[PDB]
Design a protein around this nucleic acid. Structure first.
Ligand SMILES: [Mn+2]
Lengths: 105, 99, 84, 95, 92, 102, 78, 97
DNA sequence: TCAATATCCACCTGCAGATTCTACCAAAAGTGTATTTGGAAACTGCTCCATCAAAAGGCATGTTCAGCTGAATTCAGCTGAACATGCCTTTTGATGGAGCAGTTTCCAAATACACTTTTGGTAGAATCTGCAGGTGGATATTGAT
DNA sequence: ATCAATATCCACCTGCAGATTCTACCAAAAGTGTATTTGGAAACTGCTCCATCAAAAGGCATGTTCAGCTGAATTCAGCTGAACATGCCTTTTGATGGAGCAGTTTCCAAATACACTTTTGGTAGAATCTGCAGGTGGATATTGA
């Protein structure tokens, strides 16, 4: 009954992750905690983006997160912006920004 | 009158309008066609998954919008406000797209 | 079917301007449009060429969305939203 | 005659509901998040993969995943990650 | 212990230019070049195999990996020598 | 084996590096061979150009600067190593015309 | 400690870069960039060190760190 | 009193330095900088002689590239005196800042 | 150009620090046999893709007009290159001692493995419902008097 | 200092394309008994890595001058945005034919697993050398009159 995920108190599939590691050819063998450790990092990171996205969708008056929100989220938090610096988000658009000089006198 | 917005008023209006949204700016068909033309020149008799094309377009358009910013910055840097091929050329060089 | 030709022109100037506005540009020189098509054709070719190469390797006649996503990956331009 | 393709939607959704009980996520949105997890997963596992080799050690222990995080993740994101990762593992073992 | 390609690099340097010799550092660069390329070709082939749900890196993979990895001409010649070396291995 | 494939580069060495490299479950027979030759070839390609670089400066010993001068002058190799830095290589002689007198 | 990177050296570096005339503020700016570079390349390097339980930072540690930064270096695998 | 016009040496210095490969930054001040920095991350650290060379070759070689790009930036604005702003642009476009 | 500087540059030359060649042992690479199996050949169901048809109204084009930008210039304050000085901080060269990477050698704990249960997820139908598309005043913002 | 002229803002409405749910099967974790390894933990090496010590020699730091470069102002042709009228062709929706992905099987040609036999390639001396490092002497390229 104790799915490895529940033992770690994680929401992500710890077993799923363990397997991907084995079949990914990252190493001949995988420790018993790695998948748990990593599964938690993907959870945290995921939870981190939803946190800022959900809000972005709140500001906009929407109850459903769309990509755009996701974009606004990642490009406004310095760190995520960098972690996903070479990442392109389909249907994301870009942060509103107009060079000062351009504006009217 | 006739009412005439001074040059730059509509340009900024657009800049604000097109940044607040996220719809593709190139028309879907001409792009498709363009893609197929180019792909046909690499291997005849190819079939494209409807989305494979959306991808290319999602990327191409993101790429160029991204190029224009760096472009625009170079013009600003040369005191100008009008982006010119010269600006684009510098932006790509710096970038490493074609040193 | 039909003969595809000079379709890099399908990329209308109004659009290129649009792409530029979203970019932040407020004043576009006139020589810009032909320049842009130039870069776009080159960017596209590379992304497509690579893509099609992944296609051929899987001995398939269809260009899948993943073939594009992997291509973009090699090119560094990582894409989210089309193939997990 | 079926073809079950897996994803993280179930998990991405269980998490969205912990942070925003009233918020939801559309199709595309989910697909974006699915990519994000996969990418990140590939980066972490890839880096770890390289550390074990740089050290001639045939196995990827969670200790490698952690350095992978530190090297891969920037700033506080890393701190909270490393933190969150440990809590899960220490607990898991005591299970 | 602690190997390299130093030996070979030199054998090849002798074929193209029997009269010339290579420095230590230069030979060290050449030795770094081999590894990187090796690393790239392998890593790439490695992925093609994965994308295609196949658990074995064949020479066909190394090749496709080369077309993706190497530019214009280098790619062509690199493919030939690759295909040219394989035939001779299978002949006898 | 390498001698069988008519190469200088070690087919075995490579085959060993591939199997133990985590690249995939199994390595085909001709893979290591093919790759080896591609590894040789490329080398020859750089040496021949650097070699010339040597004689080009009245030397007979290829050093770093000889490689860089051979790598950054060829468009293709330059592209292939465009994100590579050669230690003790220096830069190619280049001065913008705008900087010139007149 | 960073001020050790003497102004004359910076000019020499810029000279190789094809630079002809150098502003005065540059020097400070260059030290900042230069510092951030090293700060980033070593951080990833030592991390690689620590993980190997070592106390001594070998060259391979710098090489590996220079690769993550996409600043690959040749000739130091020896 | 023989005086070289201003800017004549520069060109001669460029021709000089571009023709050479030796490192430019003085070794000791550098190695010092290395150790100092590394100590902000770890204590009782020992750089194996070559490790510090790897860093110098790397570091110096980077600065040069940046300068080449900063030149074009300075040139692009019609100037000919690399300014700090130019360096900033160059880095911003590069994806560093 | 003429001339009076300073600067490079080949033309040769002499030893020492790298180079390259030798001379011999372990770690691999290559063999021989017995095992496993991965994916090429061979169908074959069925999504998905290529195509054709029609209507229409969202836009791409083209031509005017003229606002205000960019490019050409003029002009002089002052930043920063060329220099000749005076000094100290970098080079280097051992020499010695000692923290420390690197090796071996037992092995306890941690993994891998091969089955056998037992769910947790994914692939559809069945229910909901944000909000995409429009509608209209209420606001600003702009540009002309 | 005003006032039309418009484009943008927000809140409100309401059906339906796009989520949310609700159920069944089953590919995949999970639970256990075995069959290996793995990578520490002590033990010692020979490293290489700091540490002083101690001179000279560039190479750095300064204070002077003033060449000419970077900025600030003008000026004006004309490049490019704002508009408006035209009517083209991209969009939308549906409907099919069928090419060609993929899901299953069938099975050798091929890669892996041991357990040995032979040879190659890395090391550390041993026997060369290429370039460095200085030296003239004479064009070269600058620069003042
Ligand atoms: Mn064609």
């Amino acid at each position: 009954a104790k799915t490895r995920s529940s033992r770690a108190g994680l929401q992500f599939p710890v077993g799923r992750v363990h397997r991907l590691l084995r079949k990914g050819n990252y190493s001949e063998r995988v420790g018993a905690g790695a998948p748990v450790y990593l599964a938690a990092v993907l959870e945290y990171l995921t939870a981190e983006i939803l946190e800022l996205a959900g809000n972005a969708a709140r500001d906009n008056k929407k109850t459903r997160i769309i990509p755009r929100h996701l974009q606004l989220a990642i490009r406004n938090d310095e760190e995520l912006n960098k972690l996903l610096g070479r990442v392109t988000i389909a249907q994301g658009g870009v942060l509103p920004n107009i060079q000062a000089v351009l504006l009217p006198k | 009158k006739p009412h005439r917005y001074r040059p730059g008023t509509v340009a900024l209006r657009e800049i604000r309008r097109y940044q607040k949204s996220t719809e593709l700016l190139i028309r879907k068909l001409p792009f498709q066609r363009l893609v197929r033309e180019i792909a046909q020149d690499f291997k005849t008799d190819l079939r494209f998954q409807s989305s494979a094309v959306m991808a290319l377009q999602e990327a191409c358009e993101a790429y160029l919008v991204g190029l224009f910013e760096d472009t625009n910055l170079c013009a600003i840097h040369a005191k100008r406000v009008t982006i010119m091929p010269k600006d684009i050329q510098l932006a790509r060089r710096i970038r490493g797209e074609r040193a | 079917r039909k003969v595809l030709r000079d379709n890099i022109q399908g990329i209308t100037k109004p659009a290129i301007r649009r792409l530029a506005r979203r970019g932040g540009v407020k004043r576009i020189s006139g020589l810009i449009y032909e320049e842009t098509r130039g870069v776009l054709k080159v960017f596209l070719e590379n992304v497509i060429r690579d893509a099609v190469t992944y296609t051929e390797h899987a001995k398939r006649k269809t260009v899948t969305a993943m073939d594009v996503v992997y291509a973009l990956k090699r090119q560094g331009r990582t894409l989210y939203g089309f193939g997990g | 005659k079926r073809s079950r393709k897996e994803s993280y939607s179930i998990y991405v959704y269980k998490v969205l509901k912990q942070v925003h009980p009233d918020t939801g996520i559309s199709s595309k949105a989910m697909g974006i998040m699915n990519s994000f997890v996969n990418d990140i997963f590939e980066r972490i596992a890839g880096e770890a993969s390289r550390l074990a080799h740089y050290n001639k050690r045939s196995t990827i222990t969670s200790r490698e995943i952690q350095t992978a995080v530190r090297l891969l993740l920037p700033g506080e994101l890393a701190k909270h990650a490393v933190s969150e990762g440990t809590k899960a593992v220490t607990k898991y073992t005591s299970a």
